[PDB]
């Protein structure tokens, strides 16, 4: 259906997709709060528990940057597209 930037595991529709990505990757780990983005999930942690977050949590080594804007199919490079829809 569509994919996730972070895991490159599929979803049936962007709406399911969206709320793995508020679970698996946007989570605070200390209190479990789900944000929006991975960008405000780690400014989240850094502003309420002092804590540095640079990697995006349970994504693959190459997709595991904070900077990157992603909400559901939105803001995915088109490469990244490209490897995953053959490759
Ligand atoms: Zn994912
Ligand atoms: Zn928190």
Known sequence: ??????????????????????????????????????????????QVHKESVTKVPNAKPERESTEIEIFGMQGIPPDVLAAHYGE
Do not use: N, P, W
Not at 7 to 20: A, G, M, Y
Not at 23 to 31: E, G, I, N
């Open 1 to 46: 259906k569509v994919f996730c930037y972070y895991c490159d595991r599929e979803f049936d529709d962007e709406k399911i997709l969206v709320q793995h990505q508020k679970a698996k990757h946007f989570k605070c780990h200390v209190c479990h709060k789900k944000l929006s983005t991975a960008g405000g999930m780690a400014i989240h942690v850094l």
